[PDB]
């Protein structure tokens, strides 16, 4: 395995025994840091793209990257010991080197490429953890009290879209399967709108798996900019197209298949999320779906499954960076409820669930008048 | 149990498949960060402390440590994600607790407590973690060019000693049973002589296995005077000594059965090891022992168990706080070699190894 510690050394009966234990299995957590901080640095260095040229011992590397001999051992020999980099063995030794996979995502410019992940720690998430006490003392009520969305800002998008393309093609792949199972395909015409489209992936590899679809993307210029790139480089630009703008303005048109949200909820508030529902019903075929791709556990909050772990700890990222939550199975219940949607799927992928709505079927059991529209306002 | 990514869920050996993977192992490797952030804003706000003085929920929690209501909720269970603290829901909602052995590594001011780790990295490593890239630059050396030896100063570790105690246990338990299978036993008389200390646990937990052994830990000044509490605390007092200063001055004694150095060599240069183990040499019985406690790996650098991808990491560590290294055992027999002294024994404990020697001539 990769523990970095030996468990089969610690014993675990006695409450010094487990007090020991306990410590170790916390400082193995506390020590977390190192990974990032080693990983961001190489890249801050120019490690992983030299390595990619010409595979090097530590000294040549170091000569390359006019870095101290020791130090980039050191550096390096922490990339082997996480798994991030290789070895290959001559018969005077050996160099280090970047396996294909390891390539695609350390690179810059590539597809699944991490760099815009990297740099968004070094820019913003890494000063921001460290001010974290003084988030919680105060939350993310703005001055009048009411609660603000997620603060990282397009700017910052700018790097991260990019460097959050790797969880796309998991997902897609589900929701690909789980459409056609219900009678989609491909040689028919539909529309997709995918709600804050960042790079535009999932929308493009739907537009790969379904080559007679359509997508509309929205998100703010310098994004949409990106995604157009994108949609070209992974030959649907003739059935991609993006509207700029700010999507809680809403009127997104009519006749969509299928309204898609990745990565969007987390970012919201109570209030800007059902606004956004609403409009996703109101652009909505009779027949379409809505589909949310987010980080969702049950009311019960229980760190049971990886995806319910990343959860409630993607929650804290989200109040690091200034507003949003990792929201619950019934809170999207509620949202979905005062749409007119019904919620009639969730399915997991490696660090998400996605959520499939239909229109609703059944009226409310409180007849229309004076009493129900009271308990609208309320 | 501690896995972020279902990796059951990341399938196939395509190119694609196989890149998508490793983004996702990446990805998990990356968010280790939000871990440390949290323990620590945590220890920061309070958190520990109020939760071992009355479980809560988070709506009183946050009332009582003056913080947001939400924000508090976030924070709790991330905490609970991490199985950092426990939690309790029922049909009156959630209340949040510490377990008694997360109590004793949360708290200040316990034997095994982790708040000298925590102020360690709030004070100290965090902001030298996100300068590393202008360390190995420039390379952990002094101004005229020689290789420096870390640079965690002593007011730093007055801190961080008490915050590392947790591992002194399984690697006294480890070392006394390996004294006692070569005839140390308890009812025969022992000298022992624990080089940069800390608080004094090894030495300490030493002389209540063996309780006819006396022991001299050499510290600083304030560091010497926790560990003598420390002593106190577990009942040996009358068998630990400390010797204030810097160990390069000398004055250690004569006559010692066993020299101890518990995450010492690490901090060291080449040179300033070999000069320890030799001064170590010179201080010991016949028949006495030295006992290095460190992070040791084969030449190799392989990261084929636990504690040698952890002693990969250490050095990191001691690169990105100004020197030292997670030295091999190669380099430590040539040490042993310099000093007269010869490895005997090599006994693997959680995050280190134990090297005995004893000397050839
Ligand atoms: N009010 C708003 N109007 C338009 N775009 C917005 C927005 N608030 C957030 N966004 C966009 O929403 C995206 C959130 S990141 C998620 C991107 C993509 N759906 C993916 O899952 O990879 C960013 O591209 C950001 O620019
Ligand atoms: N030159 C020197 N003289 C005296 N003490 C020193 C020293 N250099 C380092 N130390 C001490 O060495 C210790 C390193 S931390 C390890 C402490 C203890 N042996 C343990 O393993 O828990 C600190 O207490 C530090 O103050
Ligand atoms: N919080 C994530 C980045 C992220 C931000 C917004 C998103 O919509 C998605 C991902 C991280 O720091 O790793
Ligand atoms: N480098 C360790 C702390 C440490 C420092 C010096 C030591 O001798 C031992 C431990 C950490 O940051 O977790």
Redesign the interface.
């Known amino acids: 395995?990769?523990?970095?510690?030996?468990?089969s050394?610690?014993?675990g009966v006695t409450?010094?025994d487990?007090?020991?234990?306990?410590?170790?299995?916390?400082?193995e957590?506390?020590?977390?840091?190192?990974?990032?901080?080693?990983?961001?640095?190489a890249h801050?260095?120019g490690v992983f793209a030299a390595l990619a040229e010409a595979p090097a011992d530590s000294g040549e590397l170091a000569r390359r990257l006019?870095?101290?001999?020791?130090?980039?051992r050191?550096?390096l020999?922490?990339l082997?010991?996480?798994?991030?980099i290789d070895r290959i063995h001559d018969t005077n030794g050996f160099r280090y080197l970047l396996?294909?996979?390891?390539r695609?995502?350390?690179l810059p410019g590539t597809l699944?490429s991490?760099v815009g992940?990297?740099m968004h720690?070094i820019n913003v998430?890494?000063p921001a953890?460290?001010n974290?006490?003084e988030?919680?003392?105060?939350?993310?009520?703005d001055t009048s009290g009411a609660?603000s969305p997620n603060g990282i800002a397009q700017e910052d998008y700018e790097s991260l879209v990019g460097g959050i393309n790797?969880?796309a093609?998991?997902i897609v792949t589900?929701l690909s399967r789980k459409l056609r199972a219900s009678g989609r395909s491909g040689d028919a015409t539909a529309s997709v709108l995918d709600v804050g489209c960042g790079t535009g992936l999932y929308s493009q590899l739907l537009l790969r798996e379904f080559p007679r679809w359509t997508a509309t993307g929205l998100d703010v210029e310098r994004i949409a900019t990106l995604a157009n790139a994108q949609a070209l480089r992974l030959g649907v630009e003739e059935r991609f197209a993006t509207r700029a703008g700010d999507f809680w303005r809403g009127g997104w048109g009519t006749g969509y298949d299928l309204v898609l949200f990745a990565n969007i909820f987390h970012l919201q508030t109570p209030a800007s999320a059902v606004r956004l529902m609403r409009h996703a019903a109101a652009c909505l075929a009779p027949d379409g779906l809505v589909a949310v791709v987010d980080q969702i556990v049950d009311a019960?909050?229980?760190?049971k499954?990886?995806?319910?772990?990343?959860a409630?700890?993607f929650?804290?990222?989200?109040?690091?960076t200034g507003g949003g939550?990792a929201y619950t199975f019934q809170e999207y219940e509620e949202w979905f409820t005062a749409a007119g949607l019904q919620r009639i799927e969730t399915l997991?992928?490696?660090?998400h669930r996605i959520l499939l709505a239909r229109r609703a079927t059944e009226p409310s059991a409180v007849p229309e008048g004076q009493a129900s529209e009271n308990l609208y306002f309320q």
Not at 1 to 7: Q, T
Not at 66 to 72: G, V
Not at 135 to 141: D, F, I, T
């Open positions: 395995n990769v523990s970095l510690v030996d468990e050394l610690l014993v409450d010094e487990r007090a020991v234990r306990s410590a170790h299995q916390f400082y957590r506390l020590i977390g840091l190192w990974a990032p901080a080693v990983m961001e640095a801050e260095l006019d870095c101290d001999a020791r130090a980039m050191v550096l020999d922490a082997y010991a996480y798994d991030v396996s294909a996979e390891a695609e995502c350390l699944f991490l992940k990297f720690d998430a890494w953890w460290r974290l006490a988030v919680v003392r105060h939350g993310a009520r609660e790797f969880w093609p998991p589900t019960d909050r229980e760190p499954t990886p995806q319910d772990r990343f409630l700890l929650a804290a990222s989200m109040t690091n939550d997991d992928t490696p660090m």
